[PDB]
């Protein structure tokens, strides 16, 4: 029951991973109003680079 | 930042968590959550509470800058906090942006 | 004249002959700076002779701050030894001095405006932008900074003889343009 609920949570986690992959696919199709979207993508890339530098530091 | 994990408070907390892991009373994931909450709490406490000023003077032995992190090693240093001198033979400084 | 230009800066290059991992050099060696998002090199400094090197991943290296050729070669040899001790098979190939800067004093004030008016094909002088006159000498190809106080700066040489020849060339013109 809670094992079935945990299998349901694993199915919902697969659906949430598919939803996050669909969001990333929409972001990649945006990478594939225009200036503002490009600036937001550049800011996200800079934040990812800063996170990678912090992770390499630790 | 996990930066203050290597302090007296932070390493004492890590040693207590490692003891509780060794006796199987907690999981390592739980200790990781405690370390994350400690990081948030020590960042908030250093940001809001303390408002005092220190100066220091000494001789630089070595420096390093990598992954946007400075790492210094100073010798024969005098840290000045208002009500008095603090002398130290060698000190290591780790600084994140 | 009895004025000898004293060397103040020498910039040289050398090839270590091997590809270099700059992150390993930045993490393991002392007195190093590395910020690839801003500048793609390891910036290393040593105290004897007090010099600064720029180390690239390809293996070519630039040494600055030395005041003589032997100090520059010794400094570059020491940086090559630092790179060598970290596990890399560094060599010492094609060392060459690329730039020389010296300075001296003629001990009199100089009419800079008359100098730029009479030497318009060699000089340029804009007081509001930079208070000194820039003189591009052709033989030898040396760029000089001539100031109103009398301090003279010489840059661009490949050998010491070009600095000495450039100051011996420019000294009688400066005597002809003294302030009295």
Curated annotation (Swiss-Prot), chain A:
Quote the subcellular location field of this record: Nucleus
**Function text:** The TFIID basal transcription factor complex plays a major role in the initiation of RNA polymerase II (Pol II)-dependent transcription. TFIID recognizes and binds promoters with or without a TATA box via its subunit TBP, a TATA-box-binding protein, and promotes assembly of the pre-initiation complex (PIC). The TFIID complex consists of TBP and TBP-associated factors (TAFs), including TAF1, TAF2, TAF3, TAF4, TAF5, TAF6, TAF7, TAF8, TAF9, TAF10, TAF11, TAF12 and TAF13.
Complexes and interactors: Component of the TFIID basal transcription factor complex, composed of TATA-box-binding protein TBP, and a number of TBP-associated factors (TAFs), including TAF1, TAF2, TAF3, TAF4, TAF5, TAF6, TAF7, TAF8, TAF9, TAF10, TAF11, TAF12 and TAF13. Component of the TFTC-HAT complex, at least composed of TAF5L, TAF6L, TADA3L, SUPT3H, TAF2, TAF4, TAF5, GCN5L2/GCN5, TAF10, TAF12 and TRRAP. (Microbial infection) Interacts with SV40 Large T antigen.
What family does this chain come from, according to its entry? Belongs to the TAF4 family.
Q: Which disease relates to this protein according to its record?
A: Intellectual developmental disorder, autosomal dominant 73: An autosomal dominant disorder characterized by intellectual disability ranging from mild to severe, developmental delay, speech delay, behavioral abnormalities, and non-specific dysmorphic facial features.
Q: What is this protein called?
A: Transcription initiation factor TFIID subunit 4
* Species this chain originates from: Homo sapiens (Human)
Q: What stretch of the complete protein does the chain hold?
A: 940 to 1007 of 1085
Swiss-Prot record, chain B:
The cross-references to InterPro entries, in alphabetical order and at most eight, read: TFIIA_a-hlx (IPR009083), TFIIA_b-brl (IPR009088), TFIIA_gsu (IPR003194), TFIIA_gsu_C (IPR015871), TFIIA_gsu_N (IPR015872)
Q: Where in the cell is it found?
A: Nucleus
Keywords, sorted A to Z: Host-virus interaction, Nucleus, Transcription, Transcription regulation
Q: Which GO terms describe its molecular function?
A: protein heterodimerization activity; protein homodimerization activity; RNA polymerase II general transcription initiation factor activity; RNA polymerase II general transcription initiation factor binding; RNA polymerase II-specific DNA-binding transcription factor binding; TBP-class protein binding
Q: Which Gene3D superfamilies match?
A: Transcription factor IIA (TFIIA), beta-barrel domain (2.30.18.10), Transcription factor IIA gamma subunit, alpha-helical domain (1.10.287.190)
Query: What SUPFAM superfamilies does its record include?
Result: Transcription factor IIA (TFIIA), alpha-helical domain, Transcription factor IIA (TFIIA), beta-barrel domain
Q: Which GO terms describe its biological process?
A: positive regulation of transcription by RNA polymerase II; positive regulation of transcription initiation by RNA polymerase II; RNA polymerase II preinitiation complex assembly; transcription by RNA polymerase II; transcription initiation at RNA polymerase II promoter
Keyword Magnesium listed? The answer is no
What is the first-listed, main subcellular location in coarse terms? nucleus
What cellular-component terms does GO give this entry? Answer: cytosol; nucleoplasm; nucleus; transcription factor TFIIA complex; transcription factor TFIID complex
User: What family does the database annotate?
Assistant: Belongs to the TFIIA subunit 2 family.
Its job: TFIIA is a component of the transcription machinery of RNA polymerase II and plays an important role in transcriptional activation. TFIIA in a complex with TBP mediates transcriptional activity.
* Protein name according to UniProt: Transcription initiation factor IIA subunit 2
From Swiss-Prot, chain C:
Which tissues and organs express this gene's product? Widely expressed, with levels highest in the testis and ovary.
Q: Record-annotated residues binding DNA?
A: 9, 45, 60, 99, 136
Q: Name one GO biological process term.
A: mRNA transcription by RNA polymerase II
One Gene Ontology term of the molecular function aspect: RNA polymerase II general transcription initiation factor binding
> What Gene Ontology cellular component terms go with this record?
chromatin; cytosol; euchromatin; female germ cell nucleus; female pronucleus; male germ cell nucleus; male pronucleus; nucleoplasm
Q: What does this protein do?
A: The TFIID basal transcription factor complex plays a major role in the initiation of RNA polymerase II (Pol II)-dependent transcription. TFIID recognizes and binds promoters with or without a TATA box via its subunit TBP, a TATA-box-binding protein, and promotes assembly of the pre-initiation complex (PIC). The TFIID complex consists of TBP and TBP-associated factors (TAFs), including TAF1, TAF2, TAF3, TAF4, TAF5, TAF6, TAF7, TAF8, TAF9, TAF10, TAF11, TAF12 and TAF13. The TFIID complex structure can be divided into 3 modules TFIID-A, TFIID-B, and TFIID-C.
Q: How does it assemble?
A: Binds DNA as monomer. Component of the TFIID basal transcription factor complex, composed of TATA-box-binding protein TBP, and a number of TBP-associated factors (TAFs), including TAF1, TAF2, TAF3, TAF4, TAF5, TAF6, TAF7, TAF8, TAF9, TAF10, TAF11, TAF12 and TAF13. Part of a TFIID-containing RNA polymerase II pre-initiation complex that is composed of TBP and at least GTF2A1, GTF2A2, GTF2E1, GTF2E2, GTF2F1, GTF2H2, GTF2H3, GTF2H4, GTF2H5, GTF2B, TCEA1, ERCC2, ERCC3, TAF1, TAF2, TAF3, TAF4, TAF5, TAF6, TAF7, TAF8, TAF9, TAF10, TAF11, TAF12 and TAF13. (Microbial infection) Interacts with HIV-1 Tat.
| UniProt name for this protein | TATA-box-binding protein
Q: Which organism is it from?
A: Homo sapiens
Lineage from the top down? Answer: Eukaryota, Metazoa, Chordata, Craniata, Vertebrata
The gene that this protein is the product of is TBP
What residues of the intact protein does this structure contain? 159 to 338 of 339
